[PDB]
Amino acid sequence: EDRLKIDVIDWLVFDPAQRAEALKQGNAIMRKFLASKKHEAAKEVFVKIPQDSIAEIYLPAEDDNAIREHLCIRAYLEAHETFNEWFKHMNSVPQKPALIPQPTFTEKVAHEHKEKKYEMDFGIWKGHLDALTADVKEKMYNVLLFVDGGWMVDVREDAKEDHERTHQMVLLRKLCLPMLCFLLHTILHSTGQYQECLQLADMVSSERHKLYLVFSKEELRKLLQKLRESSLMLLDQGLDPLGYEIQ
Amino acid sequence: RSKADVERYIASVQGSTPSPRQKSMKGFYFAKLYYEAKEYDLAKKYICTYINVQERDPKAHRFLGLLYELEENTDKAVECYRRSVELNPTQKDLVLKIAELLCKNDVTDGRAKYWLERAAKLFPGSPAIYKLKEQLLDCGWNKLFD
Amino acid sequence: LFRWYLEQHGQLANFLQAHEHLSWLHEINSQELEKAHATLLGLANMETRYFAKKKTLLGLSKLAALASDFSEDMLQEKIEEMAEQERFLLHQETLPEQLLAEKQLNLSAMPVLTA
């Protein structure tokens, strides 16, 4: 039935006079797929939506929200497109030169070089990494700290009742905000940014976002056993739990 | 169009969608017409507000980078392109631009070298690639000959 | 213990050495959340040397308490007495970015200022 739904979009996109209904329905369809984490499904739909839809449509409470929801959804997708690239890279680290104990004088020199070339690649694989870390992070904070009212949260409050959508928007927050936090923690930990890891407890507990309400009690503790792990590595470095110099 | 045509449309969608989020989500489409009416200090703030709510749109980010390019603010324009590129890797032409601008402004930092390498592998041996290779070297006679 | 701090199974001796301010750590580990909340708030209060750190500790304390097993009544007290702390802090938090480059102040590496 996947196709039935992703195909009803091209029918609504064809007629430009129904772009407001095409987007709204595109949202709904992408709300079902997100709850299943079908990101190639959600995105295959996301491209069918002409890149210039938003511009033309220009506002009923149903169109202000669907424009916001669409960008929220793009903010979410882009937060998985850049992580899978980053993650793919983290798993392609240059491998150490192989050792040939009891080497011939030939094998000694081939190895002096293979050992010197590797000490060039590992520097760039931290180079490319840093730039894929700086980018995946930004996206994770665009979703977690979504501007003007939080992620998947309507700004317009005068639409007509849509319990399906509304409760789909509360759910999407409880499936994906705990899951984006845990990823960002995994990104920060993987790159050794431990001080910042611990600063996820400010972001989450914050009264500005009230992200902690989107967490189950279990997920919290789990995030608290994740942070205590970053803390350790900060002690091993000689700093206090939170990364500040011990005077 | 004129100044009246675009600033009168403010009251057009203001009377159709008044909440702050939808008011800011129309910033890109507000800024779409100020770029046409030759208003770049104004268009800048319109797009920049849409970026405040739609921070993951590669089109909007690039549009601001292209607007900072008209403003000749290299540091600001480059950063905008970077965001659009990191969001969407298929924007090859922006990888050239970043490499093109990094080599023109300052070569002292290796970041200009890095982006030039990528630009090369996206456009194998294009006419612009060598042009950038010569630009980076510019910042001696025997060196150019080699 | 004072000869371990001055300097695996070293984390079992870390489990015992985490007795004292490192408390909260072995408290999250022991699943003693309510306890972790009390000391996390206590370390937040004495905190005067670093603002960014006084802010982090409360956030942790709060996430500890929320994740713990207080009755909805007690919880409502911890988060209200807390809401106060966050209320004072928010003040130093919203300090304009004009005078903080004027006064040549460190962004985060600054102290817990008083009223």
XYZ file of C-alpha atoms in Angstrom:
508
model
C 0.000 0.000 0.000
C 3.098 2.207 0.147
C 2.809 3.030 -3.567
C -0.918 3.847 -3.365
C -0.067 6.699 -1.023
C 3.172 7.987 -2.550
C 1.349 7.955 -5.906
C -1.630 10.046 -4.798
C 0.915 12.861 -4.382
C 1.830 13.244 -8.060
C -1.896 13.570 -8.788
C -2.210 16.506 -6.375
C 1.098 18.064 -7.456
C 0.097 18.033 -11.138
C -2.581 20.689 -10.550
C -0.849 23.807 -9.143
C -4.232 25.019 -7.833
C -4.074 22.262 -5.223
C -0.538 22.829 -3.945
C -1.876 23.679 -0.486
C -3.679 20.325 -0.429
C -0.713 18.517 -1.974
C 1.605 19.745 0.771
C -0.889 19.042 3.572
C -1.457 15.502 2.288
C 2.265 15.091 1.624
C 2.794 15.914 5.289
C 0.262 13.346 6.502
C 1.785 10.648 4.305
C 5.262 11.531 5.560
C 3.968 11.455 9.150
C 3.021 7.782 8.774
C 6.397 6.900 7.251
C 8.376 8.800 9.905
C 6.679 6.798 12.653
C 8.079 3.759 10.835
C 11.448 5.418 10.163
C 11.088 4.911 6.408
C 13.368 7.815 5.499
C 13.831 6.824 1.855
C 10.039 6.587 1.744
C 9.559 9.980 3.365
C 12.157 11.595 1.105
C 10.953 10.020 -2.155
C 7.739 11.831 -1.282
C 9.688 14.920 -0.201
C 11.168 15.414 -3.668
C 7.824 15.017 -5.431
C 6.923 18.252 -3.651
C 8.267 20.865 -6.088
C 11.121 22.810 -4.503
C 9.192 26.049 -5.093
C 5.881 24.978 -3.548
C 6.213 27.203 -0.469
C 6.834 30.370 -2.506
C 3.753 30.035 -4.713
C 1.190 29.033 -2.068
C 1.438 32.448 -0.386
C -3.102 32.069 5.171
C -5.590 29.682 6.834
C -4.503 27.956 10.043
C -4.213 24.760 7.991
C -1.682 26.206 5.556
C 0.510 28.024 8.082
C 1.026 24.771 9.990
C 1.563 22.546 6.955
C 4.304 24.892 5.725
C 5.923 24.714 9.170
C 5.463 20.947 9.421
C 7.067 20.449 6.004
C 10.224 22.316 7.031
C 10.272 20.530 10.386
C 10.223 17.304 8.400
C 13.053 18.540 6.175
C 15.000 19.509 9.292
C 14.496 15.959 10.522
C 15.449 14.243 7.271
C 18.578 16.390 6.835
C 19.486 15.302 10.375
C 19.654 11.702 9.143
C 21.161 12.316 5.713
C 24.222 13.923 7.316
C 24.508 11.374 10.125
C 24.548 8.354 7.840
C 27.308 9.992 5.829
C 29.187 10.866 9.028
C 28.514 7.375 10.381
C 29.599 5.698 7.154
C 32.884 7.618 7.449
C 33.517 6.777 11.101
C 33.605 3.175 9.862
C 36.239 3.684 7.168
C 39.258 4.670 9.262
C 42.623 4.069 7.587
C 43.969 0.722 8.815
C 47.380 0.493 10.490
C 50.251 -0.779 8.328
C 50.619 -4.556 8.568
C 53.763 -5.711 10.377
C 56.180 -8.245 8.906
C 58.234 -9.369 11.921
C 61.746 -10.454 10.906
C 61.681 -8.231 7.800
C 64.026 -8.324 4.840
C 65.747 -5.017 4.077
C 63.342 -4.665 1.155
C 60.258 -5.151 3.335
C 61.784 -2.732 5.841
C 61.597 0.177 3.380
C 58.235 -0.622 1.794
C 57.037 -0.494 5.414
C 58.802 2.774 6.308
C 56.626 4.241 3.525
C 53.326 2.458 4.165
C 53.772 3.645 7.754
C 54.414 7.222 6.593
C 51.501 7.258 4.156
C 49.092 5.989 6.828
C 50.291 8.828 9.057
C 48.883 11.141 6.398
C 45.517 9.478 5.809
C 44.599 9.238 9.496
C 45.088 13.005 9.677
C 42.605 13.639 6.863
C 40.123 11.063 8.105
C 40.066 13.348 11.160
C 39.964 16.272 8.767
C 36.949 15.025 6.795
C 35.457 13.794 10.067
C 35.633 17.182 11.791
C 33.775 18.743 8.856
C 31.149 15.979 8.866
C 30.891 16.347 12.646
C 30.526 20.122 12.487
C 27.744 19.619 9.927
C 25.788 16.718 11.415
C 25.807 18.523 14.778
C 24.317 21.746 13.404
C 21.424 19.741 11.911
C 20.774 17.915 15.173
C 20.458 21.277 16.956
C 18.159 22.662 14.251
C 15.713 19.844 15.012
C 16.186 19.675 18.790
C 16.105 23.464 19.155
C 13.644 24.071 16.313
C 13.055 27.802 15.986
C 9.754 29.400 17.065
C 7.983 26.778 19.178
C 9.844 23.477 19.019
C 9.797 20.627 16.505
C 6.485 19.336 15.142
C 4.736 21.969 17.252
C 2.128 24.157 15.574
C 2.566 27.918 15.886
C -0.924 28.612 14.578
C -3.651 27.816 17.114
C -6.897 28.552 15.234
C -7.221 25.527 12.941
C -10.118 23.064 13.130
C -9.822 19.857 15.158
C -7.540 17.187 13.710
C -6.857 14.678 16.471
C -5.147 12.268 14.067
C -2.561 14.840 13.003
C -2.176 16.486 16.416
C -1.540 13.183 18.205
C 0.691 12.174 15.301
C 2.718 15.292 16.071
C 3.029 14.494 19.764
C 4.087 10.934 18.985
C 6.647 11.904 16.339
C 8.224 14.031 19.048
C 8.412 11.119 21.519
C 9.905 8.698 18.981
C 12.396 11.016 17.340
C 13.555 13.551 19.924
C 14.782 10.868 22.333
C 16.380 9.218 19.300
C 18.076 12.372 17.967
C 19.447 13.228 21.409
C 21.000 9.764 21.811
C 22.590 10.122 18.366
C 24.047 13.552 19.053
C 25.407 12.111 22.286
C 26.958 9.329 20.212
C 28.438 11.870 17.803
C 29.826 14.050 20.598
C 31.246 11.040 22.406
C 32.714 9.526 19.242
C 34.615 12.732 18.498
C 35.695 13.247 22.113
C 33.623 16.371 22.726
C 32.841 15.310 26.311
C 32.258 18.729 27.875
C 29.475 19.320 25.350
C 27.979 15.857 25.857
C 27.203 16.818 29.435
C 25.603 20.019 28.128
C 22.814 17.908 26.678
C 21.395 17.965 30.202
C 20.930 21.718 29.892
C 19.358 21.506 26.435
C 16.941 18.763 27.514
C 15.897 19.957 30.974
C 15.621 23.517 29.608
C 12.341 25.270 30.366
C 12.713 27.027 27.008
C 12.064 23.808 25.107
C 10.740 21.417 27.753
C 12.365 18.541 25.862
C 12.320 16.409 29.018
C 8.553 15.927 28.725
C 9.088 14.069 25.455
C 11.167 11.523 27.388
C 9.952 8.412 29.180
C 11.479 7.981 32.647
C 13.538 5.075 31.320
C 14.964 7.078 28.419
C 16.081 9.747 30.890
C 18.124 7.392 33.074
C 19.585 5.975 29.865
C 20.671 9.491 28.910
C 22.063 9.823 32.447
C 24.162 6.677 32.053
C 25.323 8.014 28.714
C 26.532 11.295 30.216
C 28.273 9.590 33.144
C 30.260 7.827 30.411
C 31.451 11.026 28.774
C 32.267 12.291 32.277
C 34.645 9.397 32.880
C 36.764 10.190 29.827
C 36.931 13.757 31.199
C 38.388 12.453 34.457
C 40.919 10.379 32.520
C 41.975 13.685 30.974
C 42.422 15.176 34.434
C 39.439 17.540 34.438
C 36.369 17.500 36.701
C 33.214 15.528 35.759
C 31.899 18.425 33.648
C 35.185 19.251 31.888
C 36.362 22.247 33.921
C 39.951 22.535 35.165
C 40.518 21.262 38.698
C 42.048 24.237 40.493
C 7.040 46.170 -9.739
C 8.138 48.859 -7.279
C 8.535 49.425 -3.548
C 4.754 49.671 -3.160
C 4.039 46.364 -4.913
C 6.235 44.363 -2.529
C 5.579 46.221 0.737
C 1.830 46.154 0.053
C 1.971 42.354 -0.203
C 3.125 42.455 3.432
C -0.465 43.264 4.409
C -1.723 40.661 1.913
C -0.345 37.550 3.628
C -0.251 39.304 7.014
C -4.044 39.224 6.743
C -4.010 35.554 5.712
C -1.529 33.979 8.161
C -0.752 36.113 11.214
C 1.031 33.769 13.655
C 4.792 34.371 14.078
C 5.892 30.994 12.723
C 3.932 31.287 9.473
C 4.867 34.972 9.295
C 8.540 33.963 9.342
C 8.050 30.945 7.066
C 6.944 33.429 4.384
C 10.242 35.305 4.733
C 11.900 33.406 1.894
C 8.932 34.189 -0.362
C 8.933 37.762 0.910
C 12.677 37.975 0.221
C 11.978 36.434 -3.199
C 10.526 39.743 -4.430
C 12.885 42.193 -2.702
C 15.814 40.606 -4.543
C 13.858 41.547 -7.678
C 13.104 45.109 -6.495
C 16.813 45.816 -5.805
C 16.564 45.792 -2.003
C 19.497 43.879 -0.498
C 19.637 45.238 3.050
C 15.907 44.467 3.223
C 15.898 41.161 1.331
C 18.734 40.051 3.625
C 16.633 40.418 6.772
C 13.587 38.781 5.165
C 15.451 35.617 4.146
C 17.430 35.630 7.396
C 14.165 35.377 9.351
C 12.854 32.479 7.262
C 16.222 30.886 8.039
C 15.369 31.386 11.724
C 12.433 28.962 11.367
C 13.541 26.927 8.322
C 17.193 26.407 9.228
C 17.526 23.180 7.185
C 16.532 24.465 3.725
C 19.510 24.300 1.321
C 17.783 26.684 -1.106
C 17.253 29.469 1.434
C 20.798 29.187 2.801
C 22.266 29.365 -0.703
C 20.014 32.309 -1.574
C 21.453 34.250 1.364
C 24.952 33.214 0.308
C 24.225 34.458 -3.207
C 22.917 37.676 -1.643
C 26.019 38.046 0.536
C 27.935 37.501 -2.713
C 26.320 40.627 -4.168
C 27.281 42.310 -0.882
C 30.863 41.055 -1.452
C 30.982 39.721 2.131
C 33.146 36.684 1.428
C 33.269 35.345 4.989
C 29.469 35.536 5.246
C 28.738 34.328 1.704
C 31.058 31.313 1.977
C 29.492 30.192 5.260
C 26.008 30.318 3.717
C 27.059 28.110 0.799
C 28.683 25.715 3.274
C 25.380 25.167 5.078
C 23.476 24.518 1.852
C 26.223 22.123 0.734
C 26.387 20.161 3.989
C 22.593 19.823 3.920
C 22.492 18.658 0.282
C 25.643 17.068 -1.214
C 24.276 17.032 -4.785
C 24.975 20.788 -5.117
C 28.211 20.372 -7.045
C 28.244 23.935 -8.398
C 28.391 25.168 -4.795
C 31.475 23.043 -4.075
C 33.203 24.862 -6.931
C 31.984 28.230 -5.640
C 33.299 27.581 -2.125
C 36.616 26.458 -3.615
C 36.506 29.415 -6.013
C 35.918 31.955 -3.234
C 38.313 30.430 -0.691
C 41.242 30.701 -3.117
C 40.419 34.283 -4.140
C 40.136 35.733 -0.625
C 42.983 34.033 1.261
C 45.140 30.959 0.637
C 47.069 30.994 3.935
C 44.589 28.524 5.446
C 44.580 24.944 4.207
C 40.779 25.017 4.083
C 41.076 26.728 0.696
C 43.312 23.868 -0.465
C 40.898 21.196 0.776
C 37.856 22.643 -0.988
C 39.895 22.904 -4.189
C 40.686 19.176 -4.078
C 36.986 18.314 -3.810
C 36.122 20.778 -6.579
C 38.609 18.922 -8.790
C 37.054 15.493 -8.238
C 33.569 16.893 -8.904
C 34.678 18.513 -12.186
C 37.543 16.401 -13.547
C 40.004 18.688 -15.293
C 37.463 21.394 -16.067
C 38.734 24.761 -17.360
C 37.933 26.404 -14.024
C 39.855 23.828 -11.970
C 43.245 24.863 -13.333
C 42.256 28.531 -13.058
C 41.797 27.936 -9.330
C 45.083 26.017 -9.139
C 46.870 29.059 -10.575
C 44.977 31.424 -8.264
C 46.016 29.481 -5.159
C 49.657 29.597 -6.243
C 49.509 33.350 -6.902
C 49.532 34.403 -3.245
C 58.206 32.289 -7.944
C 58.520 32.316 -11.733
C 60.026 28.819 -11.704
C 57.200 27.759 -9.383
C 54.502 28.804 -11.869
C 56.322 27.121 -14.763
C 56.375 23.740 -13.003
C 41.246 7.125 48.907
C 43.192 10.373 49.267
C 46.139 8.475 47.780
C 44.085 7.401 44.795
C 42.821 10.890 44.030
C 46.268 12.506 44.269
C 47.646 10.008 41.754
C 38.721 -1.721 35.630
C 39.255 -2.925 39.195
C 40.455 0.648 39.513
C 36.851 1.582 38.785
C 35.732 -0.519 41.763
C 38.113 1.575 43.787
C 36.732 4.457 41.742
C 33.325 3.341 42.948
C 34.512 3.930 46.508
C 36.618 6.987 45.637
C 33.583 8.544 43.957
C 32.457 9.010 47.514
C 32.591 12.829 47.781
C 31.182 15.248 45.165
C 31.919 12.567 42.608
C 28.972 11.205 44.624
C 26.279 11.800 42.014
C 28.276 9.665 39.576
C 28.269 6.416 41.589
C 24.709 7.403 42.505
C 23.446 7.373 38.908
C 25.331 4.092 38.605
C 23.739 2.555 41.698
C 20.374 3.673 40.329
C 20.125 5.973 43.340
C 18.552 8.836 41.416
C 16.812 10.720 44.235
C 20.168 10.719 45.992
C 21.980 11.964 42.888
C 19.488 14.839 42.742
C 20.216 16.021 46.296
C 23.991 16.224 45.836
C 23.698 17.588 42.290
C 21.681 20.498 43.649
C 24.081 20.883 46.568
C 27.051 21.176 44.221
C 25.041 23.606 42.110
C 24.643 25.912 45.120
C 28.235 26.081 46.366
C 29.064 26.725 42.723
C 30.519 30.214 42.272
C 33.613 29.789 40.136
C 31.937 28.929 36.824
C 28.532 30.043 35.543
C 28.405 27.550 32.675
C 28.966 24.853 35.312
C 26.387 26.036 37.832
C 23.967 25.887 34.911
C 24.985 22.344 33.960
C 24.625 20.947 37.491
C 21.055 22.164 37.973
C 20.096 20.767 34.579
C 21.580 17.442 35.670
C 20.019 17.607 39.132
C 16.679 18.302 37.436
C 17.034 15.463 34.917
C 18.046 13.241 37.813
C 14.985 14.171 39.855
C 12.621 13.873 36.899
C 14.006 10.413 36.085
C 13.746 9.345 39.730
C 10.801 7.895 41.652
C 9.408 10.813 43.664
C 5.667 10.885 44.306
C 3.949 13.388 42.026
C 3.798 15.650 45.086
C 7.472 15.558 46.037
C 8.424 15.854 42.373
C 6.286 18.977 42.090
C 8.243 20.428 45.003
C 11.697 19.622 43.618
C 10.758 21.182 40.268
C 9.257 24.274 41.912
C 12.110 25.018 44.312
C 14.140 24.388 41.173
C 12.109 26.683 38.921
C 13.239 29.375 41.372
C 16.938 28.714 40.838
C 16.475 28.758 37.059
C 14.588 32.040 37.548
C 17.481 33.881 39.160
C 20.049 32.374 36.789
C 18.092 33.282 33.657
C 18.980 36.868 34.623
C 22.760 36.544 34.187
C 21.811 34.368 31.214
C 20.059 37.082 29.236
C 22.956 39.531 29.559
C 23.103 41.530 26.290
C 25.865 40.710 23.810
C 26.816 44.361 23.399
C 28.159 44.967 26.903
C 29.760 41.512 27.186
C 32.188 42.340 24.375
C 32.422 45.892 25.660
C 33.366 44.705 29.142
C 35.553 42.180 27.319
C 33.938 39.279 29.185
C 34.460 35.568 28.586
C 31.283 34.009 27.181
C 31.016 30.997 29.492
C 34.304 31.105 31.389
C 32.867 33.715 33.754
C 31.789 33.477 37.434
C 28.368 33.104 39.053
C 27.491 36.783 39.492
C 25.302 38.068 42.335
C 22.195 40.265 42.217
